[PDB]
């Protein structure tokens, strides 16, 4: 009896919350992201009998990254020269080479434009890909840039090229980060190997659709994550461990040519073409790909106990989802992937190479917004990049009869980062509490 209040201080205990986070950059920096904050020495401590829950669909920092990436891009591109004076009527006879149907933009379109001394116009010419051009009404010889009817077009600064430098986050004073490490976690539910860290590991701001590439890899066997409020999910994430390699190339040699727009900012385009004309392509090892698909199918049936499973190519929409989209070197790509998904199944080491034929277009839009088309300058020479994939984004039709079907999508840029920040949940510490005891003053 006669227990009296004792007030301990600093006791470890936390509650849910959401807060701004610091971002740290690598020591050998890019030359808030450019030079600092500095790079720490990461640490990780394992804890006994720690009980905690996670929810990869609600965790805060996923939203924050969306603001960070777009804000960084705008901060970087804001001062670069606008292209507004370039947007005028074009004349595009364009039949001056032995083969033109592949591109249809040629040298020798031509258009009037301003030059150094301002008050006298000049005539020039350069190349374009028809996917960046549209035809005006009536006269089939007049053309306009696609996005100029609605927006201004900004040109990437020629001396600058942002690229996927990894970024990792550090909680501010008072908050702590929990990680979880169970290797069969579905992305929602309790963990039994909780842990705490100084900061998160590296994450790249990679952009792609129909699959996420150049990213990290899983630990155990393939995993499938989804929401569970209703079967009618938006986007199902499948996470690989077995890395499947991929290559792509742009054989032709592009020649760089330029115009300069008094008040003195340069503009770039594509000029002469060198070498024999060909189409860009990529390669894949059928054995590895089909084995991976087999494993996915044999894991995929767990949520769908008994129906047949069949894959079919995406359907409809702008090119940002009908095809695979990714960038190497500083130019963008679009690749039809019908052949890589026309398969089926039912219940109960480099031979056979596959090839896929792609296209490249210049003018791009940030994958949701309107009114901010980015224009890239052509890269002279030829480009080739090795790469490897780690996961896929699957959405499902209406399930009919004894069969079920999936198809590739993922146009929302939110999901990509949802697939690499499923680990962390940020909480605040409450260093004050109370308890009873019996000590007496004795003053």
């Amino acid at each position: 009896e006669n227990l009296w209040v004792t007030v301990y201080y600093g006791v470890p205990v936390w509650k849910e919350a959401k807060t701004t986070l610091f971002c740290a950059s690598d020591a050998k920096a890019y030359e808030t992201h450019a030079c600092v904050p500095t790079d720490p020495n990461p640490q990780e401590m394992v804890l006994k009998n720690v009980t905690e829950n996670f929810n990869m669909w609600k965790n805060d920092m996923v939203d924050q990254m969306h603001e960070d990436v777009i804000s960084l891009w705008d901060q970087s591109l804001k001062p670069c020269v606008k292209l507004t004076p370039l947007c005028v009527t074009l004349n595009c006879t364009n039949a001056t080479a032995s083969n033109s149907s592949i591109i249809e933009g040629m040298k020798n379109c031509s258009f009037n434009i301003t030059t150094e001394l301002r008050d006298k116009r000049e005539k020039k010419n350069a190349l374009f890909y028809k996917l960046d051009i549209v035809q005006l009404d009536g006269n089939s010889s007049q053309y306009r840039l696609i996005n100029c009817n609605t927006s201004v077009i900004t040109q990437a600064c020629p001396k600058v090229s942002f690229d996927p430098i990894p970024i990792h986050y550090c909680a501010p004073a008072g908050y702590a980060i929990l990680k979880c490490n169970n290797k069969t976690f579905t992305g929602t539910g309790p963990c039994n190997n909780v842990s705490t860290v100084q900061c998160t590991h590296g994450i790249k701001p990679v952009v792609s659709t129909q699959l996420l590439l150049n990213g990290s890899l899983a630990e155990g066997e393939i995993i499938i994550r989804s929401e569970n409020i209703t079967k009618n999910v938006k986007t199902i994430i499948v996470h690989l461990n077995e890395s499947v390699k991929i290559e792509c190339t742009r054989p032709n040699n592009k020649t760089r040519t330029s115009i300069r727009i008094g008040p003195g900012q340069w503009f770039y385009a594509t000029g002469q073409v060198i070498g024999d004309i060909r189409e860009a392509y990529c390669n894949i090892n059928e054995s590895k790909w089909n084995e991976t698909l087999q494993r996915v199918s044999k894991k995929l049936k767990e949520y769908f106990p008994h129906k047949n499973i069949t894959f079919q190519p995406s359907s409809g929409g702008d090119l940002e989802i009908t095809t695979h989209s990714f960038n190497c070197g500083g130019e963008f790509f679009y690749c039809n992937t019908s052949s890589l998904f026309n398969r089926t199944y039912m219940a109960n080491n480099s031979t056979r190479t596959i090839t896929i034929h792609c296209r490249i277009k210049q003018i791009i839009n940030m994958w949701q917004e309107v009114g901010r088309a980015m224009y890239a300058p052509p890269i002279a020479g030829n480009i080739t990049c090795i790469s490897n994939i780690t996961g896929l984004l699957l959405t499902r039709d209406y399930g009919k009869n004894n069969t079920e079907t999936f198809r590739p999508g993922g146009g929302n840029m939110k999901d990509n980062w949802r697939s690499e920040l499923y680990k962390y949940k940020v909480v605040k510490i409450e260093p004050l509490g109370v308890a009873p005891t019996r000590c007496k003053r004795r003053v």
Partner: nanobody
Amino acid sequence: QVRLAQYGGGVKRLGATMTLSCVASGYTFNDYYIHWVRQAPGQGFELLGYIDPANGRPDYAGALRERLSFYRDKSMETLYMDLRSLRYDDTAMYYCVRNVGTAGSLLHYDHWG
């Protein structure tokens, strides 16, 4: 406050192609789906398919994948529907409805048109 108005429709000749349309109002165009639902007179409803405005993905009911067609144009917040080879049994009303949704799941409809 939020509205969804329709144009077109009217009578059509048998076996002919037909069009409809919705015009969005200033709630937000990139943050919600859109559905099409039709109602034969004195019959229970049924759904056709849903078109996202973000990127343009369609998805069709199993009974009409040969005949329907969707596409959008974000520049003016507009959505067009193409229906090919009308049959006598398609005579009905057509609506145009919004659909709340979270980052990972869909839910009820709220603002019919």
